[PDB]
Each structure stands twice: as structure tokens, then as C-alpha cells.
Design an enzyme around this catalytic site. Structure first.
Site, PDB file in Angstrom:
ATOM      1  CG  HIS A   1      -2.339   0.515   0.828  1.00 57.14           C
ATOM      2  ND1 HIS A   1      -3.444   0.304   1.623  1.00 57.14           N
ATOM      3  CD2 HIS A   1      -2.771   1.242  -0.230  1.00 57.14           C
ATOM      4  CE1 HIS A   1      -4.497   0.880   1.073  1.00 57.14           C
ATOM      5  NE2 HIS A   1      -4.115   1.455  -0.052  1.00 57.14           N
TER       6      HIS A   1
ATOM      7  CG  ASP B   1      -6.086  -0.532   4.788  1.00 55.85           C
ATOM      8  OD1 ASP B   1      -5.957  -1.550   5.497  1.00 55.85           O
ATOM      9  OD2 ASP B   1      -5.119   0.037   4.243  1.00 55.85           O
TER      10      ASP B   1
ATOM     11  CG  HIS C   1      -4.121  -1.627   8.937  1.00 54.23           C
ATOM     12  ND1 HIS C   1      -4.253  -2.608   7.979  1.00 54.23           N
ATOM     13  CD2 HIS C   1      -3.771  -2.259  10.082  1.00 54.23           C
ATOM     14  CE1 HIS C   1      -3.994  -3.783   8.523  1.00 54.23           C
ATOM     15  NE2 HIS C   1      -3.700  -3.597   9.797  1.00 54.23           N
TER      16      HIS C   1
ATOM     17  CG  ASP D   1      -2.314   1.890   5.497  1.00 53.36           C
ATOM     18  OD1 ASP D   1      -2.059   1.209   6.514  1.00 53.36           O
ATOM     19  OD2 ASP D   1      -2.663   1.388   4.412  1.00 53.36           O
TER      20      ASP D   1
ATOM     21  CG  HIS E   1       2.524  -1.517   4.580  1.00 54.96           C
ATOM     22  ND1 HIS E   1       1.999  -2.789   4.471  1.00 54.96           N
ATOM     23  CD2 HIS E   1       2.926  -1.386   5.866  1.00 54.96           C
ATOM     24  CE1 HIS E   1       2.083  -3.399   5.640  1.00 54.96           C
ATOM     25  NE2 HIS E   1       2.642  -2.570   6.503  1.00 54.96           N
TER      26      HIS E   1
ATOM     27  CG  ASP F   1      -4.850  -3.074   2.682  1.00 52.56           C
ATOM     28  OD1 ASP F   1      -4.828  -4.290   2.394  1.00 52.56           O
ATOM     29  OD2 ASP F   1      -4.135  -2.578   3.586  1.00 52.56           O
TER      30      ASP F   1
ATOM     31  CG  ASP G   1      -5.169  -5.155   5.224  1.00 49.85           C
ATOM     32  OD1 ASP G   1      -4.005  -4.929   5.610  1.00 49.85           O
ATOM     33  OD2 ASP G   1      -6.009  -4.251   5.034  1.00 49.85           O
TER      34      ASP G   1
ATOM     35  CD  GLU H   1      -0.259  -4.038   1.748  1.00 56.48           C
ATOM     36  OE1 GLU H   1       0.415  -5.085   1.686  1.00 56.48           O
ATOM     37  OE2 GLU H   1       0.227  -2.943   2.094  1.00 56.48           O
TER      38      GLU H   1
HETATM   39  N1  DMO Z   1      -0.543  -1.054   6.430  1.00 56.81           N
HETATM   40  C1  DMO Z   1      -0.187  -1.692   7.722  1.00 56.81           C
HETATM   41  C2  DMO Z   1      -0.281  -0.656   8.755  1.00 56.81           C
HETATM   42  C3  DMO Z   1       0.094  -1.350  10.053  1.00 56.81           C
HETATM   43  C4  DMO Z   1       0.647  -0.396  11.168  1.00 56.81           C
HETATM   44  N2  DMO Z   1      -0.380   0.593  11.469  1.00 56.81           N
HETATM   45  C5  DMO Z   1       1.948   0.320  10.749  1.00 56.81           C
HETATM   46  O1  DMO Z   1       1.998   1.577  10.715  1.00 56.81           O
HETATM   47  O2  DMO Z   1       2.992  -0.335  10.430  1.00 56.81           O
HETATM   48  C6  DMO Z   1       0.960  -1.326  12.383  1.00 56.81           C
HETATM   49  F1  DMO Z   1       1.926  -2.328  12.001  1.00 56.81           F
HETATM   50  F2  DMO Z   1       1.527  -0.570  13.501  1.00 56.81           F
HETATM   51 MN    MN Z   2      -3.305  -0.418   3.577  1.00 55.32          MN
HETATM   52 MN    MN Z   3      -4.311  -2.738   5.733  1.00 52.20          MN
END
Ligand code: DMO
Ligand code: MN
Ligand code: MN
Ligand code: DMO
Ligand code: DMO
Ligand code: MN
Ligand code: MN
Ligand code: MN
Ligand code: MN
Lengths: 315, 315, 315
Positions: free
Chosen positions: B97, B120, B122, B124, B137, B228, B230, B273
Site C-alpha cells: 500500500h 482498509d 488500517h 495507514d 505501507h 487494501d 486486508d 496488499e
Molecule cells: N498497512 C499496515 C499498517 C500497520 C501499522 N499501522 C503500521 O503503521 O505499520 C501497524 F503495524 F503498527
Molecule cells: Mn493499507
Molecule cells: Mn491494511
């Protein structure tokens, strides 16, 4: 701040299948206390209640293990009232659902105005005379309803019980396997419930709106949430004694609890019927316990949209 | 007629797990181009962007692979703008992403008035200073928000980036794992979002109504959908780097896209993803890719109620 | 009281895959008759129709097994009318869905004012000229619509058929795989349908409200429910010939039927497309059959909130 009072209730004699008494163990082992603390939670663990073995406990008519069940609840009721007196939200880790008798009784001693939200696939409202299984985890509510006292025979082990809630102070959510006698009581006492049929019809959002509005409408009062893990679909909580397909989703489970948490009125919580022994695979065990932890964590603040401390993260 | 501009973005350095750079491969191999053509689609494939290897790319503080990530996005942004200039809906096949930075940037060059719908699990939206994983990502949105510029340090590889969207021009759908710093930004910038809690409460129908009304209300403008995989429950898209249980259903996933398609405003699309390497079984891979194709096909017209050409089938 | 008229229709020539003719067998073997009786049901089993073997049955153009299919329906139509004349709700255990031609025809002879609720992933409304598969379980509705007569060529085996329902007397629920020609007919005849897109948008509660209001609005009339098990998601009914992901949930399936039951107008019921041979595991077979039984039992009164006889269970 939200203070938690953990109470382990490794008890299983309210039903036939052993292993559910391991519930407190697997839940703590999953980092429940730690994860609760990983939030804005003030957690005090009161340990696991030591439920003395009652060897002489023949059935009362067909009701099995009445003295064992009755005592465990009596013990729990005291511990629960104790935690409440310490100004803490009582978190009871079961153990079969028969424990709700003590958990709700003890809670009602410190907070008689409490309202109960019962998440379960069953109504557990059979009386010793309507039950056909004789399993007490299918009768807790009958012993607690003031309107049913008189229909409750004197079962050994429950002379200490005093109905503390009215039919109007409880709401069922997730029902999908209700016994005939149980349904009669539902319709006869005018008990508020949202079987799976109502959840399908209205959606969990309206269901919860109606639940909280029904219980908190007139005025605000402490909320007791008795969550039977078999209330959620077996796809999420398989390791449980009486699973029934077509249950509440993981999402609906979290929605219920997130909303209850948002009321700021959660006063008592029961996480019941988690039985590691019934997992057909080690993954069914983790899946069940993990979901049980999630539901618990949501009750105390964990929101899916996110959480952040009263700080300026950008600075 | 709907013209598509396919862009393969085999990139993975926005996160740790390799294999996601195979996303374009498995998606094309699944007959995506062909199936798109099996509809009323004018498809032009711009191939897979050749992301040169950047061997020297040590972390910037804790942000990993900044130069690699920044370059890939820079390359993609140009290709995306190119496809847009050719009057085609850009379809970016990821790839992690982090690529959204280039995809949305490039799109905004040809269509500055674009609105973003971000599906998503998340947000992001971590900045290089709020991220704890250092994985880019999980930071794409921070680099794109005009209101966050100034909170974004000069990370090697992103000197070309210019925030092109305001907090008010984006809507999140499906959130269930948001970092604390990310939530602060959500609540601080007043970003419109529908976490899984909102979807449960309102239902995907109202969610989508509110999303399109929020973005297209004042006036109509190009829509950029950054999907995304996920965002959907892991039961449908398991082969992904950061799966989270309690996600959008296959049905909700298709509903989102069917509705976005019906607006006739889809201008940019990201399918991110998808990581074949993370499938615990060959079936988890196909299941993931199949669902990814379905979502894509719905974005371009495939309706579950059916489709028929402007002909009289009965004659 | 609700009287049931069981009719076994072990027929499979409306489609390629054999095994679906075992549907009546596995359903009865699952205790369907017994469980129906375990309720307030007056059940009369008319046995399994003996569908004589028609060896000479070459395709009519591309339509396969027309004489076999046509005869089976003709036989069923008579048996169905017979059961209706005996004042019983006809319960047809299939067998492929082509049988709906006879089931609905026979029903309409005793009750011409009937309304049809069609739960299926498909519209099964292809005509012999629009079908591309030539499988008759994908054409039953075309032979029954008065508005389509004239578009239906004289297929061997169906000279006895007379369209008995108008486009306005049927409602589809669960559609997600509709052929182009089928969609044209949908939009051209103005047929009421709730594809999976509509169920997602409105929720099964409103869907059902609109369905019953649409069919029973003007006035009350007998309801014919033709339930194709592939209408439910394959996660619940895998052992079926034409499964399609993103189907109605077990809960939605039960909601549909519970609501139809509550109308007190269920007059005819079809449980089609259950094929034990297509179960990838013995559990997929039981899962499919179990769900099929549940849906049937709900049609006749089994409510998830519970059921109780007209007695005072507390005494
Ligand atoms: N796209 C994945 C995001 C996951 C996340 N928020 C990150 O910032 O890495 C987590 F792993 F803390
Ligand atoms: Mn994402
Ligand atoms: Mn995600
Ligand atoms: N908590 C389980 C309740 C199940 C029950 N309703 C019972 O009363 O035992 C059923 F087994 F009949
Ligand atoms: N009941 C199955 C219907 C499937 C069908 N629409 C058909 O007409 O055969 C498809 F296979 F094209
Ligand atoms: Mn239960
Ligand atoms: Mn229970
Ligand atoms: Mn079908
Ligand atoms: Mn069918």
C-alpha cells in the site's frame, strides 16, 4: 479511569462437560490481565476462587450437583460484592454459566438497581421443575427473577439465594435455542429479548440502541453483562459446551460490548462457558480464547476505530 | 464505455514480507485483463513498472527503505498521470500500500479535485515520526494530506511529494486496527471514517450512502478508490501481510465497489496488499486472488443482479 | 394446525451432475419427517415419485433431457395438486430445480392466485432459446411466466405446461449469478427481485418486509416458496451443483422462512438442489442437509426465539 476486579471462577458442575473450569487459566494465560493494563485499565486480580470439593451431592430430583453449584455461586456472590465495594468493575472468568447466580446476586447487593444484559444462545431461565437436562447452567436466571420465586423449589445449596432482579431489568441478546418452558416464561413475564431473529431483522445497531434505551431509558443504573461465549457463532467460539450455529458474529460481539462500554455504566461482567477441552483442534482453543479476550477488552475501552491517550501525538 | 489503464506495481519495500510484489503476476494470471474485457471494458495494459533496485537504502531514523519506497511511488505517480491523460481509469495492481502515495499523487495531477475512498483494516496515516513499525505501507496517507505537511520530515526519496488531498477529501471504510497516533490524527483533522463499528451500526448500505454523499455532496468529482485487500475479512483474503479478523464481508466488499461503480465517477483504483507467499495453502492464495478479482470486476460494472448488453435478448 | 404433504422428487436430469436425485433420501434420513412431527405438524408422506426412465431423450436444439425433465414435472404437478386438494402444504424434496415447473404448476391448479418467493443464487429464468447451458434447472421460471409464453418453443415433454404466474406474482431473493438474457427479462418484465446487492443495502429484514408487502399488499393469497439451497452461501450448503460465493447466511435463510411462516400463508414449499455426491467431505454433506432441514423446519414454525405449546409450563 476504569478499575477492574478480576475473579477467576474455575467451576464446571453446572453442566456435564469438564474443562470449562480451565477457563480462567487459559484466559489469563492469553495475557488478559496484561492486555487490560496495556489500556487505561487499573486491574486488581482477586485470584481464582477455590471451590471446595463437595463429594456428597446427589441430584435433587433431576437437578445435578445442586450443592456444588449453589456453594460456588454463594462463594462468588461474596467475592463479587467485595470487589464492588472496592469500587471496581467485577470481571468474572468462568466456569459454566450457573455462576451467574452468584455473580449477579453479589453485584446486586452493592448495586440493587442494576440492569442485566444477557448475551447467550440460550435463555438459561429454566426452573428446577422445567429443566429437562437438570444442568444448572441452564437455570441461573430462574433463581434470580423475583417474579419466579415461588416456582423455585428449595434446592439444596441455594437457601442463600434471594431473587434480586425483575423480568423488566434484563435483556437477552443472541437467543437461538430456547426450551419450551423457557419460552413460556419469556412471553409470560414479558421479558425483553432479541433472539437471532430480531438481530437479523433490526441489525445489531438498532438492537443495542433498543437494549440500552430499554434498560437506561427511565434512568441510569449499573449494567451487568453476562456474556456466554456460545452466544457468538461457533465459528468464533467453538470450544464451548453448548454451541449453536447461526450465532452473533465476531463483529456483532464487539459491537455489543463497545456500545456497552460507551455507556460508562458497565458495572459487572461475566465471561462464561469457555471450555478449552472441547476444542477439536489447538486452533479452535486459541480461536475461542482469543475471541473471548477481544470481547472482554472491548468492554473496557478497546475500540475498533482506535484509541489514543489524552496527548498531542503530533506535537 | 469504460476504458481501463492497467499498471502493475510489483513493489514490496513498504513492508517486511516479500511476495506482495507478485500481486500483479497472480492477478493477471487469474485472467483479470481477460475478464475485464469479457465485460464492456476497453482495457489497455501499461505493463509492470520496472522498479530499479536501490541497494543503498538504510533506514531514515526508523522508517525502512525510504528511497526504494519513495522512488517506486514517484515512478508510479508518473505512470498514473500518464494513463489519466489518456482518458483512462488507472488500475494499479500492487504491491504494498505504500504505492498509494504515487498512485494518488499522479492521479491528483490530472484530477486535483479527486476524492478518495480508502477501504482498509488500517488507516495507514502514520507519519515517519508516529510510526512504530517504520513500514511505509502504514504511512502513505500522512504524505498526501495537506494538513499534515510540516509534520512530515524530509525522508530520502520523497522530495518530489506534494500533499494533494485535504482531510475532508477522503473517507475510510473498514478500520479495525488503528494505531494511537493514527487515531489522534483522525479525531484532530476531523477525517470521515466508518470503522467496522460504524459498518456494524449502520450497515454497509447507509455507510456507502454517507460516503458518496459526503464526497460527492457539494459537487461531483473523480473518485480514487484505494482498496487494501486486508480490509476484507481474512476469511476471504488470507494471503495478505497484515490481516485482522472481523473484516468486511465478501458481500460488503462487492457492495462498496458496485456502488462506487454506479456513481460513474471511479477515476482511479488501487488493488493492494495481495501477497501469494502468505497463503497457508494453495487455496488461500486462489481464495485471496479470486476475491481481489471480483472486487476489481465490480468496480468496472459487474453487478450481482446481472448485466446485459443494449440488445433485445428475446428478439 | 399445519398439515404437511411430503413429496419426494428424486430427479436430476434438469442438470448434469447426478446425486441430487438422492436429495429426498438424505433429507428423510436426517429425520425431517420426525422433526416436523416433533412440532405442531400433521405430516403425511406421499413417498418418492417414481420417475420412469426415458432412454430416448436426445437434446432439443441444445436443451438437454427435455422429455425426462418435462415428464418428471408433469408427474410432480399432479401429485402436488393432489396434496393441495387434501388441504395440505405441499413439501417437495428435490431433485434439481427444474421440478419447480411441475411443483408450481400443480400448486396453481388448486390455487391460481398463488404468489411465488424464489430463493436462489440464480433466476432460473432462461428460455430454451436464451439458455447457453441447455440445463433445464436454469429455465423453470420461463415456462411458468404468462408473459414469456410465445418465447417458449414447443420443447418435447412440455406440451402439458401452461404458464400460470405473471411477472408481478414472483419475488426473487439472493441473486448473484444471473445470465445476460436472464437479466434482460428481469428488467423487461419488471420482475421484483432482491439480488445480494439489495440484501446488503437493505438488510434481510426490510427485504422480507418488501417481499411480503409486494406479494400480499393488495390482498392475501397462497405463498409458494421455491428454495434452491445454493441460494445460501456455499459455507452452509456446499453439496449443491451450482454454488456461488457471497450467498445468504444461515441466519438470513432462517429469517426468510421464519417470516414466511409467520404470514400463515405458506402453501407450497420446494427444497431443491441438495446433492450429497458433491460434498467434498462427509461433513459438507451433513452441513448441507442439516441446513436444508433447518430451513424447512423454520417454514413450518420452528422459531429461534423459541416455541411453546398452549399450556402453562409453570403450573
Ligand atoms: N498497512 C499496515 C499498517 C500497520 C501499522 N499501522 C503500521 O503503521 O505499520 C501497524 F503495524 F503498527
Ligand atoms: Mn493499507
Ligand atoms: Mn491494511
Ligand atoms: N446453558 C445451556 C442451556 C441448555 C438447555 N436449555 C438446558 O436447560 O440444559 C438445554 F440443554 F435443554
Ligand atoms: N440453476 C442453475 C442455473 C445456471 C445457469 N444460469 C443456467 O441456465 O444453466 C448457468 F449455468 F448459465
Ligand atoms: Mn449458552
Ligand atoms: Mn449461558
Ligand atoms: Mn441456483
Ligand atoms: Mn435454482
Amino acid at each position: 479511569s476504569r478499575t477492574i476486579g478480576i475473579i477467576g471462577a474455575p467451576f464446571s458442575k453446572g453442566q456435564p462437560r469438564g474443562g470449562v473450569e480451565e477457563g480462567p487459566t487459559v484466559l489469563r494465560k492469553a495475557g488478559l490481565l496484561e492486555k487490560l493494563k496495556e489500556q487505561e485499565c487499573d486491574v486488581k486480580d482477586y485470584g481464582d476462587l477455590p471451590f471446595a470439593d463437595i463429594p456428597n451431592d446427589s441430584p435433587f430430583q433431576i437437578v445435578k450437583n445442586p450443592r456444588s453449584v449453589g456453594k460456588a455461586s454463594e462463594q462468588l456472590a461474596g467475592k463479587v460484592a467485595e470487589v464492588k465495594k472496592n469500587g471496581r468493575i467485577s470481571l468474572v472468568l468462568g466456569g459454566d454459566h450457573s455462576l451467574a447466580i452468584g455473580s449477579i446476586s453479589g453485584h446486586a447487593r452493592v448495586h440493587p438497581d442494576l440492569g442485566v444484559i444477557w448475551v447467550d444462545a440460550h435463555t438459561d431461565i429454566n426452573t428446577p421443575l422445567t429443566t429437562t437436562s437438570g444442568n444448572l447452567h441452564g437455570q441461573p436466571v430462574s433463581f434470580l427473577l423475583k417474579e419466579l420465586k415461588g416456582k423455585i423449589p428449595d434446592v439444596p445449596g441455594f437457601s442463600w439465594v434471594t431473587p434480586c432482579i425483575s423480568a423488566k431489568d434484563i435483556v437477552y441478546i443472541g437467543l437461538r435455542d430456547v426450551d419450551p418452558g423457557e419460552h413460556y416464561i419469556l412471553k409470560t413475564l414479558g421479558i425483553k429479548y432479541f433472539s437471532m431473529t430480531e438481530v437479523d431483522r433490526l441489525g445489531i445497531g438498532k438492537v443495542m440502541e433498543e437494549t440500552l434505551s430499554y434498560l437506561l431509558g427511565r434512568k441510569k443504573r449499573p449494567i451487568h453483562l453476562s456474556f456466554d461465549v456460545d452466544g457468538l457463532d461457533p465459528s468464533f467460539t467453538p470450544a464451548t459446551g453448548t454451541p449453536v450455529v447461526g450465532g452473533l458474529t465476531y463483529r456483532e460481539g464487539l459491537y455489543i460490548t463497545e456500545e456497552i462500554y460507551k455507556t460508562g455504566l458497565l458495572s459487572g461482567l461475566d465471561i462464561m462457558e469457555v471450555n478449552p477441552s472441547l476444542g477439536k483442534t489447538p486452533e479452535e482453543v486459541t480461536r475461542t480464547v482469543n475471541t473471548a479476550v477481544a470481547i472482554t477488552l472491548a468492554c473496557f475501552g478497546l475500540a475498533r476505530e482506535g484509541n489514543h491517550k489524552p496527548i498531542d501525538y503530533l506535537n
